[PDB]
Amino acid sequence: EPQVLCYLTSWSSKRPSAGRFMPENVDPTLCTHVIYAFATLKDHKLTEADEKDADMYDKVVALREKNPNLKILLAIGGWAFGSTPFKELTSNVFRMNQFVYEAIEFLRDYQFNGLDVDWEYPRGADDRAAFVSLLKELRLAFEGEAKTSGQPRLLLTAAVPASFEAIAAGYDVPEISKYLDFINVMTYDFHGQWERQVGHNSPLFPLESATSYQKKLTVDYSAREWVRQGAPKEKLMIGMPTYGRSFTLINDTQFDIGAPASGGGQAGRFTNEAGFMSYYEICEFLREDNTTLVWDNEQMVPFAYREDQWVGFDDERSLKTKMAWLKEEGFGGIMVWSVDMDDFRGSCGTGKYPLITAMKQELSGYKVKLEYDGP
């Protein structure tokens, strides 16, 4: 029973031509859960972010009609949303409780299977306690509802950071682990266009020559840090990105990890953000002339460069390798960011959804079992 939780970004519907992604585009057999991001808070209540969203919620749910075991969740928060609304949400019990009772009604009305909470990020003791009370109250009310109610309990999940420093600052790990059904660790964005050296978005292992700090910026170390802090392995869903992060090189002849960079790489035609590329945009980049693909055998991920453009990403081989690591460590499953950025049209020349397919096939047969795993 390894789980596969796939994020669906609302704004993917706004991309041009082939990029355009709609709930209909979702293969309902790929993922065990689809998490729709993001709803918002208005007057401290769970509400639809845009008036056009309600029809989208309807479309995402009802994927179910095509796979009745598929769970559909709604996410609130995200990076843009910030910390202040969550702080104000949890500032008093009545607001908090009323948010809780209405969220349940909101969710039951749309027939969602549960709520994903993405506070980015709690920081400091007051936030730490507030995040715990919020999760504690959602969880208990979800249960209480299932009993005073008819059906199966609403699911509760949260996206959490990979940075070991963010973990200490924001997360009472053992406490949140009691209330969450799934802990979705964001094991990506380790490097990017905010830095002035080239580095990979989501390296599995570090370079042997890495500084003790750079060694921590990896999928492997992050996931292990979550375990070390008390997260139950069966609830830990390790984040898998279907995008890459790109750089403009200072010097075309310097293209190795650590090479000087002036900023992000040229935007992809569909995601329109320098420094960022969806997987189908990567494939386009790779078929340009003279683009050299490299396999980093220490980090265990690919990257590619052509003239002053450099991109670090995940492909079939790196994701499969990650699944092998995953099973060996014994984690409960994966989280995918995001389903709309995998090559859902099969324009890379392999199949449709080649990234998620590759992970799914490599996960076939895996059963998660807890056992003593040393310190």
Numbering used by the authors: 528 to 902
Per the authors:
GH18B crystallized in space group P41212 and its structure was determined by molecular replacement using the structure of human AMCase as a template. To study the substrate-binding mode, the structures of two complexes of GH18B were crystallized and obtained: that of wild-type GH18B complexed with (GlcNAc)3 and that of the GH18B-E647L mutant with a bound (GlcNAc)5. These structures were resolved to resolutions of between 2.2 and 2.8 Å, and all data-collection and structure-refinement statistics are summarized in Table 3. Secondly, the structures of GH18A and GH18B are very similar, with an r.m.s.d. of 0.88 Å for 344 Cα atoms. Although the overall structures of GH18A and GH18B are similar to that of OfChtI-CAD, with r.m.s.d.s of 1.3 Å (for 367 Cα atoms) and 1.5 Å (for 360 Cα atoms), respectively, there are obvious differences between the two enzymes. Firstly, GH18A and GH18B from OfChtIII do not have the same surface hydrophobic planes as found in the GH18 domain of OfChtI (characterized by Phe159, Phe194, Trp241 and Tyr290). Secondly, both GH18 domains have shorter and shallower substrate-binding clefts than OfChtI-CAD. As calculated by the CASTp software with default parameters, the volumes of the substrate-binding clefts of OfChtI-CAD, GH18A and GH18B were estimated to be 1628, 1399 and 1100 Å3, respectively.
